[PDB]
């Protein structure tokens, strides 16, 4: 009974001190910035070859490999220059709603409605994909997946909970909980030494991969959480959600810098990436667009008109020379 | 393709394309139906014909030159919403109704509600199921059917009870185009798979309309 | 583990036909490319044919075209090569390997037993100066060859691939591009070059490192191969 009275005063603090550190917004910094002009990209690859709804994908480190996951189960890895396919993994379950790269690029990892996160290796010495290893333990959906190593793994599931597996081992290091709903998606920093992941509860917080301790919880999203990614330089992340509004926050300020929301914008966003720079921030909505936002301003920079149907998955290379989008159309297109 | 490595690699990919081809082509006699229902109300013993194969649970019986796939999403314990777009593209929603559930019923009611509102489910038409007719004109004659709907009025025999319950489901449906499949089965029912059958069958020919441009 | 194991050879009078099988066991032997490399008594490796995957592409050598037809049997993972008319430079030990192409792969990495037959009585030229080079262990060494066209192409790529044939073993692929050490290697080896003039460097030589030395393009067909470099002790 006096807890509850002592958990509401201590928001109450937290309150009083976030607004402390509010002296001036993020627009009212960066006013006198001249702007980035009309982003004009253009298409130049289009990967066809997958059947059902596209859900997932993600770049190797050398930005030239691509793996993406369907509907279909099938798990294709593409060669995005020449667009070849490089090779066609068939999964156990066709239900699959992420894909991870290995930073080394020798793992490749999938999961989905099955509750297990399924890894398989490519340099092997039968020249055939094998499964390698499958982690169980979560009792809900899969929803993101996310390499530290070459042999840990970080997962977010539909139980509330994140996880740090073992791929050698194959157990479950340590679990992250304090999620109050389903958790839809989490960003490595790049140092990989935390990560924030954003829930149904409308909130995300940051958690140190070291401690298995929440640093930091960052609100002010009206409805569930889609998708998340770190700023480039890992102080800041900027979040998509189904409020139809991007919100970029600062762990160090422990705020919300600026909103990215626009009266046109009705629907929810499904993917949220960065450029290289740190200064577009392209967003994937259920419209069948992806806007660029100058991240600084708040402002449409442009628009990548392309597929027929939902916008599920963006990636940008970590060389910045090119971003790739996939669709429930069952299309990839490369854009730079 | 100049190099001779690279002309190989370009093999390898024409190879790779032709079996996703053939693999398309293979699962293309497919019809897959989403299970829906309250707990106990006989959904994993609709046909007899199972042939299973936590998580999402899949049965794959074949009939008359067509082969039934059957997702059972019991279990998973999460937000629906989040997960169901996964079923977008099903041909059609089996739903379970146990008519001896009296305290289940107020659940299977709102569940047929929200699934038949779901804006991607806009368009899917539902096959609804009244399991275990037996057990239930057991049950009215000891316990009358008021307790469950205290606005009943008609009288209490058996043919007017389950048009009644029947009623009910089909009156969540608001929306056109949609059309729902009511059947009342038992136990002892094999022509289960024959209901769905001539069930799914007046639901292609509904969607061809569509796409052939005569609606 | 892989293994690859060919037989047909032995003894065969001139203008007669053998058949040589290679039998494949431990791996996925329907997605790899298959070649058969000959070597004559002491004199050095030569590209003989190569059959694709699935079989739609084959090549032969000019010396053995026509009388030479390469064949895949996948259903059973055995390799053929039949040979109709047979001369006296026909005779050598004939290999059987294996190669995979896809964007970044090692497509000369395991190389089969051998087996030796026996007959009774344009190209790009790839040059290696020397024939021999003694050295003693803990000795920096370095071994170069030349080539008549460039290797490297638009693509960024230099096709050219390093093999060591130890005394009384099969060739073993070191480096299969310009300077990508094969799996399996010590990181000791390295692999250097621009264009038309390579070399292989190697540190801290070891009392395992003794062979013959071959490098070879793999630009355009048909494949050709070095005079080969001798480490003595």
């Known amino acids: 009974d006096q807890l509850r009275q002592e958990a509401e005063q201590l928001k109450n603090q937290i309150r009083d001190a976030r607004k402390a550190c509010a002296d001036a917004t993020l627009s009212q910094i960066t006013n006198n910035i001249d702007p980035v002009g009309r982003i004009q990209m253009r298409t130049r690859r289009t990967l066809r070859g997958h059947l059902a709804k596209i859900y997932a994908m993600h770049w190797g480190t050398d930005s030239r490999l691509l793996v993406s996951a369907s509907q279909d189960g099938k798990l294709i890895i593409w060669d995005s220059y020449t667009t070849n396919k490089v090779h066609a993994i068939p999964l156990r379950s066709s239900w699959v709603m992420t894909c991870a790269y290995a930073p080394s690029g020798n793992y490749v990892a999938c999961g989905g409605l099955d509750n297990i996160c399924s890894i398989y290796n490519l340099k092997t010495r039968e020249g055939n994909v094998r499964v390698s290893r499958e982690l169980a333990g979560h009792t809900g959906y899969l929803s993101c997946c996310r390499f530290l190593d070459d042999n840990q793994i970080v997962t977010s599931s539909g139980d509330t909970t994140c996880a740090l597996w073992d791929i050698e081992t194959g157990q479950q290091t340590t679990t992250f909980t304090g999620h109050t709903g389903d958790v839809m998606s989490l960003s490595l920093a790049p140092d990989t030494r935390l990560f924030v992941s954003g829930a149904c509860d409308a909130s995300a917080k940051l958690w140190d991969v070291r401690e298995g301790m929440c640093r930091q919880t960052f609100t002010g999203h009206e409805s569930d959480i889609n998708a998340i990614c770190f700023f480039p330089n890992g102080n800041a992340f900027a979040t998509g959600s189904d409020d139809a509004t991007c919100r970029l926050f600062d762990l160090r300020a422990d705020q919300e810098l600026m909103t990215y929301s626009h009266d046109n914008i009705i629907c929810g966003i499904t993917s949220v990436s960065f450029s290289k720079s740190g200064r577009l921030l392209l967003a994937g909505y259920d419209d069948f667009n992806c806007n660029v936002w100058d991240a600084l301003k708040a402002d449409r920079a442009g628009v990548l008109a392309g597929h027929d149907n939902r916008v599920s998955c963006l990636g940008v290379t970590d060389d910045g020379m090119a971003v790739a989008t996939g669709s429930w159309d069952s299309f990839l297109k490369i854009w730079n | 393709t100049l190099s001779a490595e690279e002309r190989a690699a370009l093999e390898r990919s024409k190879a790779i394309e032709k079996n996703l081809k053939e693999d398309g082509i293979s699962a293309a006699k497919d019809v897959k139906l989403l299970l829906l229902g309250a707990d106990n109300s006989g959904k994993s013993t609709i046909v007899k014909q199972m042939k299973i194969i936590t998580g999402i649970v899949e049965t794959h019986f074949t009939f008359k030159n067509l082969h039934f796939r059957l997702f059972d999403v019991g279990g998973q314990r999460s937000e629906r919403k989040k997960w169901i777009h996964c079923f977008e593209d099903v041909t059609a929603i089996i739903f379970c109704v146990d008519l001896s559930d009296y305290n289940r019923m107020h659940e299977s009611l709102m569940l047929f509600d929200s699934i038949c509102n779901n804006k991607f489910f806009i368009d899917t038409s539902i096959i609804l199921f009244l399991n275990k007719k037996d057990l239930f004109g057991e049950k009215i004659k000891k316990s009358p059917l008021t307790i469950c709907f205290p606005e009943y009025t008609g009288p209490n025999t058996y043919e007017d009870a389950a048009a009644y319950i029947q009623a009910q489901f089909e009156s969540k449906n608001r929306s056109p185009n949609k059309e729902i499949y009511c059947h009342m089965t038992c136990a002892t029912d094999t022509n289960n798979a024959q209901v769905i059958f001539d069930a799914v069958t007046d639901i292609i020919i509904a969607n061809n309309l569509r796409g052939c441009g005569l609606y | 583990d892989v293994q690859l194991v060919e037989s047909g050879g032995g003894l065969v009078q001139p203008g007669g036909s053998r058949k040589l099988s290679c039998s494949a066991s431990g791996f996925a032997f329907s997605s790899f490319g298959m070649h058969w490399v000959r070597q004559a008594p002491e004199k050095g490796l030569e590209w003989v044919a190569y059959?694709?995957?699935?079989?739609?592409?084959?090549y032969y050598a000019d010396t053995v075209k026509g009388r030479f037809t390469i064949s895949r049997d996948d259903p059973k993972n055995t390799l053929f090569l039949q040979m109709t008319s047979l001369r006296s430079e026909d005779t050598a030990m004939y290999y059987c390997?294996?190669?995979?192409?896809?964007?970044?792969?090692?497509?000369?990495?395991?190389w089969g037993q051998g087996t030796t037959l026996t007959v009774s009585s344009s190209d790009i030229v790839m040059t290696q100066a020397t024939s021999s080079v003694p050295v003693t262990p803990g000795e920096s060494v370095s071994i170069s060859c030349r080539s008549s066209?460039?290797?490297?192409?638009?693509?960024?790529?230099?096709?050219l691939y390093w093999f060591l044939q130890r005394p009384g073993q099969s060739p073993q692929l070191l480096i299969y591009?310009?300077?990508n050490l094969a799996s399996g290697v010590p990181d000791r080896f390295s692999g250097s070059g621009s264009g038309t003039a390579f070399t292989l460097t190697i540190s801290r030589l070891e009392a395992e490192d003794v062979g013959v030395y071959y490098c070879?393009?793999?630009?355009?067909?048909?494949?050709?191969f070095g005079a080969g470099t001798k480490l003595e002790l």
């Open positions: 591009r310009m300077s």
């Open positions: 070879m393009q793999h630009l355009e067909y048909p494949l050709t």
């Open positions: 390997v294996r190669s995979i192409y896809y964007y970044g792969s090692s497509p000369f990495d395991f």
């Open positions: 066209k460039s290797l490297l192409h638009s693509n960024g790529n230099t096709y």
């Open positions: 059959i694709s995957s699935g079989s739609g592409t084959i």
